[PDB]
């Protein structure tokens, strides 16, 4: 119930997401990234220090953008094939 604990859970999930992302399993990375984002969101809800909140927020944004990149690539992929 501590943002440290959500944070850990989030970071854990985001690490798996990255491994998958690096391994080109984008559909699974996508889900993983988004699981991670749920935790980071909880973490920043339970955190009260505005500099720490800002830090978590900045990382949240970077993983959100990565996720959407993979999502575009992934639709555009078949759309180029199909």
């Amino acid at each position: 119930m501590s943002t440290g604990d959500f944070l850990t859970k989030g970071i854990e999930l985001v690490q798996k997401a990255i491994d998958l992302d690096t391994a080109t399993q984008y559909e699974e990375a996508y889900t993983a990234y988004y699981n991670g984002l749920d935790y980071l969101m909880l973490a920043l809800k339970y955190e009260k220090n505005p500099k720490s909140k800002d830090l978590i927020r900045a990382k949240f944004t970077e993983y959100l953008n990565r996720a959407e990149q993979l999502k575009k690539h992934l639709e555009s992929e078949e759309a180029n094939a199909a």
Partner: peptide, 22 residues
């Protein structure tokens, strides 16, 4: 009410954010 006030210097110690691929 179970909030934290976390010292960011320490947040950045006790939790290291992995980066995304290029």
């Amino acid at each position: 009410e179970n909030y934290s006030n976390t010292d960011p210097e320490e947040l950045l110690r006790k939790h290291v954010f992995p980066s995304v691929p290029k």
